Amino acid sequence: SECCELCVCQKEPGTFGALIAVNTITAIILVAAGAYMAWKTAAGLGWNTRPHGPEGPPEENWLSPGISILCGVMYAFKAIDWASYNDTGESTAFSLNQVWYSDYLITCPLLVLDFCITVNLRYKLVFSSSIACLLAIAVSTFIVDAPYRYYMYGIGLAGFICAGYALWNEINAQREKIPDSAWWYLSAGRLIFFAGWPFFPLLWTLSFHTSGVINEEWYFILHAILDILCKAVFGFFMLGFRLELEELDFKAIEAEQAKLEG
Amino acid sequence: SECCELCVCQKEPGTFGALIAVNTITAIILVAAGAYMAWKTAAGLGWNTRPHGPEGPPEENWLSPGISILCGVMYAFKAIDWASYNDTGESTAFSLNQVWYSDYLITCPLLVLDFCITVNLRYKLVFSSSIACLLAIAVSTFIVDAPYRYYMYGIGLAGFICAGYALWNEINAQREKIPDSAWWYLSAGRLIFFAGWPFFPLLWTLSFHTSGVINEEWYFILHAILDILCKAVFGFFMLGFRLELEELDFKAIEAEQAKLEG
Amino acid sequence: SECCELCVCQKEPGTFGALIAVNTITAIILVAAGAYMAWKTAAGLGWNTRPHGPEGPPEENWLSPGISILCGVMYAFKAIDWASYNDTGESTAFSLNQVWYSDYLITCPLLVLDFCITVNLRYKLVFSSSIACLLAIAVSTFIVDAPYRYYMYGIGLAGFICAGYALWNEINAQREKIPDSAWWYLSAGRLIFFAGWPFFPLLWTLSFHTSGVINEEWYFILHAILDILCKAVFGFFMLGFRLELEELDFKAIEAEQAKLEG
Ligand SMILES: *C/C=C(C)/C=C/C=C(C)/C=C/C1=C(C)CCCC1(C)C
Ligand SMILES: *C/C=C(C)/C=C/C=C(C)/C=C/C1=C(C)CCCC1(C)C
Ligand SMILES: *C/C=C(C)/C=C/C=C(C)/C=C/C1=C(C)CCCC1(C)C
Ligand SMILES: [K+]
Ligand SMILES: [K+]
Ligand SMILES: [K+]
Ligand SMILES: [K+]
Ligand SMILES: [K+]
Ligand SMILES: [K+]
Ligand SMILES: [K+]
Ligand SMILES: [K+]
Ligand SMILES: [K+]
Ligand SMILES: [K+]
Ligand SMILES: [K+]
Ligand SMILES: [K+]
Ligand SMILES: [K+]
Ligand SMILES: [K+]
Ligand SMILES: [K+]
What's the CATH fold of domain C17-257? Predict the structure, then answer.
């Protein structure tokens, strides 16, 4: 039928509790992580919350909490949607669970931008737009029928590997500048970027529409954990990196000022 | 049926004259207001149209006329759409009247940005993106079915109140800088922002889909007046503010130059 | 029926080879042109590929290759879509051939921006957003029914003529600055802009939905050539302009430095 054997549209009303629970929990996690990040950025500069200043926190210091909070709002909307599936058995009109990877568009162009701004990686906009385009091909690979979904997957994967290589090069060409104390958080966010991301593309090969190992319910459940790790946990490592940099900057400024007085 | 009792889809062909008229009138108003604003910005700097310069009017001086003109084009498209409902009785393919608050997305992210640029309010992009996201929840609250539209409304209203509080704080933390002559126009645009906006959210509670006091025809008619007051009249007050600032700046420059010669 | 007499939906499975071929060829052309442009921008500054520097190529030097490559990816997706029409006889779920001029949105706001950045034309964002809005009216004129498609066409054409006039003025008010060596490429990209663009609007008058001279198959075939000329060939002239400017800049810097040493 319209709903494939392994879809959430074949599940009966009353059997969606797991999905609502997972999505509410992730909404809370993402929103609260983003709120901690927001508090940390507002409260102060470095690890010891040094008073910001007249201009306040930079506007890019809000990109990171921003994504986490927005993804949490998205997940709350998804859980509201899943609750309609539990009752009416037929979703909402505004379902963020209908189009797969449609929310990942926004989130990704915002995260790659974050990384590229914080680490001062070059071609910030280039990278961010490339990822938006590769995550538009991702949506397509879920909608487009069999033979052509694999052709589209090929294009998307080629570009993903190309952009990944270029990104790797950029981070490794900024390693010299990045202090060793701040590199821990960077390498952790990179690890999240090079392992965690390829996971999204490989889970495709075992998905409900491709193979059929993971049914749509469980695919959705797994993409929630992956979002906690991207979005939320990526931002906590990037927040850490930022704070380390800002504490080291405070230290450097204070030392420069000591030498200025002396 | 698909069309609720109090909808424009239940109205017979030939009974849409009022809607076409209102929407054409508002199109004219918004476009002409934006054109006056455009002329004023191009012609000169302050109230006495002081010759601009080599670079010309700043690109942000076009955000304000821009929105008004675009909303007027939107309303012209809406009136064309309403004319098809008057004749064919079944709308156009490209109807800006189908999805409610879908046009408000663009207009709002552009207006909050305007305010934040002109008054130099901090977190410009943050505020503008927050409003875009809260006006995406607004569209949802019109499409999503009963129980879940109120859950979504709750999220949207929470964020609206949060962003409103934050905005209020920002404007009041910039009051010291803003000259008293320019504050008149600011307080008027703020009044339009804190009263006029909450009106949009409260009319929801009495709308065709929520309660049923205001049928979709009249809801549409009221949202046209509200757009004249937001968009058009908001920009005339903001244009006024800008011009006041620019005239005071011209005065300050001329005084500084007199002291430079002396 | 839903498909008009002169549409690609009336063509039988197996008769789409021409469309696939044209769209694959254009995909290759656009991608390869954009890749040459990308190589040229990365490799060096001017015509003689002068080593760039620490910061590398400006982020706007990627807007031009970018569009060409993205339009090539779009056309590859279109050819994949056309192959489904050749086999299944009913398109893909993600068809870039469904909505007419929907891809032109992105491409156009990116190209006008390019021109305005490279030639330092004023009102860059204004122009780019105007074109995005006029190319949203373009999509409408393909979907909206008879009487109202001509009303929308009128609005779109009025704005197109207005923006065209304003653009002409801007380029002619920057002619004095632009060196004569670089003007060749500029006038060629302008020629592509003032002739080539009006072609898009005039082909509308003879299209499958308006008149019926050009059926949708051949309209699609012609819009592919027009994209090679816009996108691809526009960027090769703009790449040329950029390179000329950069070689002249290198020359000027080297002369200034000779005088600095002397
Ligand atoms: C926070 C959101 C994330 C990390 C989403 C990432 C999405 C991708 C890395 C998409 C990957 C792809 C697919 C699974 C579909 C098409 C092929 C790829 C590789 C672009
Ligand atoms: C110029 C356009 C304007 C002023 C539109 C504003 C729209 C809102 C303030 C939306 C308000 C909300 C709803 C009516 C729906 C969801 C809840 C709110 C408060 C976000
Ligand atoms: C690279 C993409 C290009 C050059 C697309 C350009 C599209 C236009 C110039 C659209 C023109 C118009 C229509 C054919 C429909 C509505 C009326 C116009 C003039 C805006
Ligand atoms: K901070
Ligand atoms: K950042
Ligand atoms: K998300
Ligand atoms: K989804
Ligand atoms: K994050
Ligand atoms: K002005
Ligand atoms: K402004
Ligand atoms: K509007
Ligand atoms: K509407
Ligand atoms: K306005
Ligand atoms: K270059
Ligand atoms: K450029
Ligand atoms: K294209
Ligand atoms: K098309
Ligand atoms: K190009």
Answer: Rhopdopsin 7-helix transmembrane proteins (1.20.1070)
d(C-alpha A69, C-alpha A231), whole Å: 9
Within 10 angstroms of residue A83's Cβ, the number of other Cβ atoms is: 20
Backbone phi, psi, residue A15, to 5°? -110, 25
CA distance B130 to chain A (A): 9
- Cα torsion through C62, C67, C72, C73, rounded to 10: 80
* Whether the Cβ atoms of residue C80 and residue A143 lie closer than 8 Å to each other: no
Question: Which residues contact residue B183 at a Cβ distance below 8 angstroms, ignoring those fewer than 6 apart?
Answer: B175
Scanning the structure block, which residue is given the tokens 């090969």? A205
Domain ranges of chain A: 17-257
Q: How far is CA B177 from CA B1, B119, B124, B126, B183, in A?
A: 57, 9, 17, 22, 10
Neighbours of B252 (CB within 10 A): 10
- Counting DSSP H helices and E strands in chain C, the numbers are 9, 0
* Residue B45: its H or E element: none
> Measured between alpha carbons, how far is B139 from B152 in angstroms, rounded to an integer?
10
Max intra-chain CA distance, chain A: 80
Residue type, B140: S
- Residue having the nearest C-alpha atom to atom 12 of ligand 2: B201
Q: Which residue has the tokens 């025809």?
A: B217
Nearest to B118 by CA among B70, B68, B185: B185
For residues C229 and C111, is the Cβ–Cβ distance under 8 A? no
Residue A15 neighbours by CB under 8 Å, 6+ apart = A86
Ligand nearest to the CA of A115: 5
E-strand ranges in C41-191 read none
Q: Which helix (H) or strand (E) holds C73?
A: helix C63-87
Distance CA A235, CA A227 (A): 11
Q: What beta strand segments (E) does chain A contain?
A: none
The minimum CA-CA distance between B5 and chain C, rounded to whole Å, is 26
> Is the domain B17-256 a CATH 3.90.1150.10 member?
no
The residue assigned the tokens 């064919």 is B88
End-to-end CA distance of chain B: 80
**Ion ligand 7, residues whose Cβ is below 5 A away:** A 97, 100
Selected residue of B99, B126, B162 to mutate for chain A interface (largest A Cβ count, 10 A) = B126
Nearest neighbour of C133 by CB, restricted to B70, B87, B92? B70
- Declared resolution, Å: 2.7
The method of structure determination was cryo-EM
Chains contacting C (3+ CB pairs below 8 angstroms): A, B
Nearest by CB to B124, from A59, A70, A87: name it. A59
